[PDB]
Amino acid sequence: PQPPKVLSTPLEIAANLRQLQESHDPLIITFHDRSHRFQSYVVHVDRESNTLALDEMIPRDGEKFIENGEHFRVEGFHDGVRIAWECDHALKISEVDGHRCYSGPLPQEVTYHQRRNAFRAALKLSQLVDIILDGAHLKGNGAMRGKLLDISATGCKLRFEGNVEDRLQLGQVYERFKAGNPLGLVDTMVELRHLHYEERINTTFAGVRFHNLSGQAQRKIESFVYQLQRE
């Protein structure tokens, strides 16, 4: 679990906002009591002037709510961290070289949340590792063949052809998980944490957590994770 850090100083607040800016990290703007989510970007951060400017709404019609001076929440990711805050102040709509933006004071507080205990390295789609998901509590007939999509020191993301939801159970433990080269995992225990089926591409994705791993198994998983980002 663990809740997000609450950043409450102009120094920290501006530093994180500058990162969203310099990286052009997309923001999702949600207006109070309005379903639709709009997109923006941080385009100006000036701590001395206590000024923050957001990029023109997308869709453009959302600018209407800023004119209405409606309250909204803003959230964006930077290097895996969810940076979020509330804007309850009136913004000024400005236009520079045709590009418009909304500027106002820096938020008094910003939340900083990153929930994963270990970095997940994604595998190139052209180099997916073959895996087998199996165990005594697996429903249906036979072990399930699949592919490894991402992996961290603590778990991994798997891919299975077709819909396999009914053959699995959230929270269930599978003691016969295997992974081919270059991991060479055998008789590994994994616990299903999340899954969903995507009809459009007839694929079920699942997130599992490792359990009771030997040192050798850990060093092998961790060295792969390390190597995956080496490239």
UniProtKB/Swiss-Prot annotation:
3',3'-c-di-GMP binds at Q114, R115, R116, N117, A118, F119, R120. Interacts with the flagellar basal bodies. Monomer. Binding of c-di-GMP produces a dimer to monomer transition. Acts as a flagellar brake, regulating swimming and swarming in a bis-(3'-5') cyclic diguanylic acid (c-di-GMP)-dependent manner. Increasing levels of c-di-GMP lead to decreased motility. Binds c-di-GMP with a dissociation constant of 165 nM. Binds 2 intercalated (c-di-GMP) dimers per subunit. GO terms for cellular component: bacterial-type flagellum basal body. InterPro entries: PilZ_domain, Split_barrel_FMN-bd, T3SS_YcgR, T3SS_YcgR_PilZN. Changing S152A: 4-fold decreased affinity for c-di-GMP. It comes from Pseudomonas putida (strain ATCC 47054 / DSM 6125 / CFBP 8728 / NCIMB 11950 / KT2440). Changing R115L: 4-fold decreased affinity for c-di-GMP, binds 1 c-di-GMP per monomer. Keywords: Bacterial flagellum, c-di-GMP, Nucleotide-binding. Gene3D superfamilies: Electron Transport, Fmn-binding Protein, Chain A, predicted glycosyltransferase like domains. The gene is ycgR. One of its GO terms (molecular function) is cyclic-di-GMP binding. Changing Q114A: 1.7-fold decreased affinity for c-di-GMP. It is found in: Bacterial flagellum basal body. This is Flagellar brake protein YcgR. The lineage of its organism: Bacteria, Pseudomonadati, Pseudomonadota, Gammaproteobacteria, Pseudomonadales. GO terms for biological process: bacterial-type flagellum-dependent cell motility; regulation of bacterial-type flagellum-dependent cell motility by regulation of motor speed.
